[PDB]
Amino acid sequence: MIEIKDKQLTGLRFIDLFAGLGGFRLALESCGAECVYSNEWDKYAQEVYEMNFGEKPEGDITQVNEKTIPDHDILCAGFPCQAFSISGKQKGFEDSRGTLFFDIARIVREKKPKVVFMENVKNFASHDNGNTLEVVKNTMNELDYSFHAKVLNALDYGIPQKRERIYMICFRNDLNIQNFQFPKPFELNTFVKDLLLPDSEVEHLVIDRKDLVMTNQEIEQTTPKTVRLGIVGKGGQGERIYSTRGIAITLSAYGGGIFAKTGGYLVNGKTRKLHPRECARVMGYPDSYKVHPSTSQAYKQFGNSVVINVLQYIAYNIGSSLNFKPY
DNA sequence: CCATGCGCTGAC
DNA sequence: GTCAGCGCATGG
Ligand SMILES: Nc1ncnc2c1ncn2[C@@H]1O[C@H](CSCC[C@H](N)C(=O)O)[C@@H](O)[C@H]1O
Structure with a gap:
């Protein structure tokens, strides 16, 4: 990760759904945002998360009563990708681990955060002739949100890995955020x-x-x-x-x-x-992050995770857009 | 659980 | 064509 001078997200609360290792947490906290809720059902994932953040995430989001989740400004979610990855079967919304977006939507419908920051594999964007993406877009719009989506390659953001992921930034319509921009590559x-x-x-x-x-x-x-x-x-x-x-x-x-x-x-x-x-x-991930003791579990966790640097740049740009409130 | 050989899809 | 993928299936 990198050092963030202007903590753009200072004073903002966020939730860490499908927490995994807590990449979104490292990213938004580095910007000054406060994490008020985490959810991750895998036992070992909960172990490392707790090892690094001192709290165990709630389990199965599908059974969590939307209404119990703390009020928040930004909902973070790198939802399951096995159902959309170019490397799998691609059964999409008709897969047991491919319906999570609707749980996210169910949560957003109730708590109306200012921002919904989601992530998934590159193939998500072209999956099922774009209908999957369209579904997400329309769902977000009906909930009264703008929908900004773009595939960014980690190699363009300072990290030597060709991890191409689609990032979707959605702002609540009443905020009239017209200046959001995905970071420029370098x-x-x-x-x-x-x-x-x-x-x-x-x-x-x-x-x-x-x-x-x-x-x-x-x-x-x-x-x-x-x-x-x-x-x-x-x-x-x-x-x-x-x-x-x-x-x-x-x-x-x-x-x-x-x-x-x-x-x-x-x-x-x-x-x-x-x-x-x-x-x-x-x-x-910084060297200070304690990896899970089980190598097999650590390999799995990192393979499912996000590149912090990319999230930090995006998170910073979300904050920049939210802070521009001229008279 | 951990290890491994897929075996195909998609992006050019 | 060339080549890479937050995967799957099956063994133990
Ligand atoms: N129903 C469910 N409830 C809670 N967590 C779930 C879930 N289904 C999948 N997950 C978790 O969601 C994650 C999707 S991968 C996300 C990784 C995370 N962005 C990171 O920074 O590491 C996995 O950890 C998986 O165990």
């Missing part, structure tokens, strides 16, 4: 190689497979793109190796393959997957 000055842990701390992650196929030579100059240096097996998900002079591929929650959830990287002559701390870093 040059990448950080690469995978710059976030790695010392070799001593990561030897156990080295996999020596006899089927490594060097598809491309390592590169001498750093580049803001994912450079595949080779595959293993059939080169499917979890079986591709990339240059550390480039950027990280998208971290995943239930990803498979020998380099599950992080992908392989050619490091100082060797081939290995990322360590949970490196995943923390690739997601913009």
Whole structure:
């Protein structure tokens, strides 16, 4: 994450739905906003959340009575994506874990926050010939909100990972917010190689497979793109190796393959997957964030999470729009 | 639970 | 064509 001088969200309360690791919490708090409610049903996720924020999030949002949720100014929600991801089945709203947006909508209908800040995978935008997105848009509008949506790639915001996510910012209509803008992209000055842990701390992650196929030579100059240096097996998900002079591929929650959830990287002559701390870093999490003790659970958590830096820029721009109240 | 080989969709 | 994806299924 980065340092935020002007705390644009000072005095604003927000809720952290589908909390996960609390990325939205890191982002909005860094802007001066106060978290007054969190909800996350996964046992282990609740563990890390509590480990870092000192409170356990409420469980199953589908059973939470909308009316019990504390009044708030900004509702934050990076809802489930398995039902929309390009990597899954794409069953959408007809999937058990694909109807959560309606719970969010049910909550908004009752508490009318000033802002609804949501996030989901890039494929969400084009899913089901845009109807899924349209549904969200129309739902937001009927609730009397503007709807601002855009896919932003983490690589354009200072983090070496090609995580393309759609962000939807909605402002309550009576606020007449006409100046909201998604942050402008800037040059990448950080690469995978710059976030790695010392070799001593990561030897156990080295996999020596006899089927490594060097598809491309390592590169001498750093580049803001994912450079595949080779595959293993059939080169499917979890079986591709990339240059550390480039950027990280998208971290995943239930990803498979020998380099599950992080992908392989050619490091100082060797081939290995990322360590949970490196995943923390690739997601913009500060080194002070305590990762969950179970590696498998930490890999999953980070793969489901958000890039803090991107949220901090957006969160700042939401605050800028809210503060412009001239006579 | 943890590990892994998918095996296809979508974006160009 | 080329190649990457907050995934799935199945083994133990
Ligand atoms: N019905 C439900 N009630 C509460 N939490 C739920 C839920 N269904 C899914 N979730 C949780 O919502 C999350 C979606 S992924 C969101 C990650 C979060 N943005 C972060 O910063 O890490 C997962 O942690 C999942 O366990």
